[PDB]
């Protein structure tokens, strides 16, 4: 596997290079159907770019075709959510779904049951902002989600997950964080992935109900 032979800087540059673009919503009444359609249309175009980016996540090509399908179908909503949360960091109290679709908690009440997941997304974005989450840290967490969300439902994936951990610590040590600050920040970031998993599971219930 070529992923395990990369240095930390090469792993960072490879992940930053594979970042998908920020798409726009259609922008064409005010309805829950009009709003769910705009988000459905937007997420469907993000998925296509999301299927290109994991292909460039180191260690993902090494998996079999059936395993790649398994990881993506487990983590796709998580990856969409952490990307949205990341885009919204510098817009407190608002979720930037697109540069032309910036919504606050109040506008989320237009859809039934979304205001709860809306508040959880806002709280996750505020937490990233107070930690000063860096882009290099963000692309590492998003790769972790992809390789970890479906891994227990395998040594190669776990050895890649270890290298991504080495990369996060490498970034923190380079920024001047003490050893204690390194393992605390690492723990803080990875614990957020549990809430992102929680938000994904709540989101899947409404999608299976909307269908």
């Amino acid at each position: 596997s070529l992923a395990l032979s990369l240095t930390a800087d090469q792993m960072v540059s490879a992940l930053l290079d594979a970042e998908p673009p920020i798409l726009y919503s259609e922008y064409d009444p005010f309805s829950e159907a009009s709003m769910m359609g705009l988000l459905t249309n937007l997420a469907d175009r993000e998925l296509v770019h999301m299927i290109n980016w994991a292909k460039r996540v180191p260690g993902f090509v090494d998996l079999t075709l059936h395993d790649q399908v398994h990881l993506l179908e487990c983590a796709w909503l998580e990856i969409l959510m952490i990307g949205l949360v990341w885009r919204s960091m510098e817009h407190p109290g608002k979720l930037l779904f697109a540069p032309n679709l910036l919504l606050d908690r109040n506008q989320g009440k237009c859809v039934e049951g979304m205001v709860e997941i809306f508040d959880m997304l806002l709280a996750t974005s505020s937490r990233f902002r107070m930690m000063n989450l860096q882009g290099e840290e963000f692309v590492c967490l998003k790769s972790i989600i992809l390789l970890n969300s479906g891994v227990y439902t395998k040594d190669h994936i776990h050895r890649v997950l270890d290298k991504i951990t080495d990369t996060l610590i490498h970034l923190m040590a380079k920024a001047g964080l003490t050893l204690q600050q390194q393992h605390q920040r690492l723990a803080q970031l990875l614990l957020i992935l549990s809430h992102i998993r929680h938000m994904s599971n709540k989101g899947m219930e409404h999608l299976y109900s909307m269908k």
Binding site: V48, I51, K55, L65, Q68, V69, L72, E73
Partner: peptide
């Protein structure tokens, strides 16, 4: 569908 995008 997901296989074709990966292939």
């Amino acid at each position: 569908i997901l296989h074709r995008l990966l292939q």
